Amino acid sequence: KVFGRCELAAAMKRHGLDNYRGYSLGNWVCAAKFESNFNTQATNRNTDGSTDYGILQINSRWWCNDGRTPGSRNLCNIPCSALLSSDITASVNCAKKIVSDGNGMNAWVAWRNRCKGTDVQAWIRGCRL
Ligand SMILES: [Cl-]
Ligand SMILES: [Cl-]
Ligand code: NA
Numbered sequence: 001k002v003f004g005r006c007e008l009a010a011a012m013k014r015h016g017l018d019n020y021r022g023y024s025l026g027n028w029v030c031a032a033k034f035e036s037n038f039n040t041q042a043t044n045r046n047t048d049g050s051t052d053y054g055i056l057q058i059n060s061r062w063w064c065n066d067g068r069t070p071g072s073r074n075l076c077n078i079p080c081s082a083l084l085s086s087d088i089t090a091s092v093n094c095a096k097k098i099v100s101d102g103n104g105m106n107a108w109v110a111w112r113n114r115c116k117g118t119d120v121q122a123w124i125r126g127c128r129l
Contacts, residue, residue: 001086003038003055005029006127008088013129015092021099025129026120027111028095032056033123034110040091041084054083054091056098056108063094 003011009029012018018025035057036042044052050061050069058076060069066080076094083091098107105111 001040003032003040003088005033005038005123006129008032008038008055009124009127009129011088012092015089017092017095018129020096021104023099023105024120024124026123027105027115028056029123030115030118030120031105031108031111034114035108040086040088043084051080053080054085055088056083056091056095057110058083058091058094058098063098 009025012028013025017028032038032055036055038055040055042054042057044057046052048061050059051066052059053064058064060066060072060080062073063076064078064080064083065072065074076097078090078094083094099105101107
């Protein structure tokens, strides 16, 4: 499922991402925009063998089990395929564990490179939130 910008904003807000760990809703939408282009089915294989899964490109090295990343952790205790559902609940729940990991949203390279310090409010603009 390729979310609309405001649709994803509403889903993330409903799931508790708005100001989760002090990151306003626009940060998550922006992160999701540049991680996955709002596509829940987005997958990207990293060079270390791990794969980023879903609307938030959650990595199999630490957070989800895809059965093909030796030495992984699966800290969100989910199959990585659960991060690709049209329902972003698993991605959000896992994102909360990721953003609470210590580095905040810097865990998302796209957020740090393309959303951090930008006018992330623009991403929830015009959204009936
Ligand atoms: Cl959803
Ligand atoms: Cl933080
Ligand atoms: Na894993």
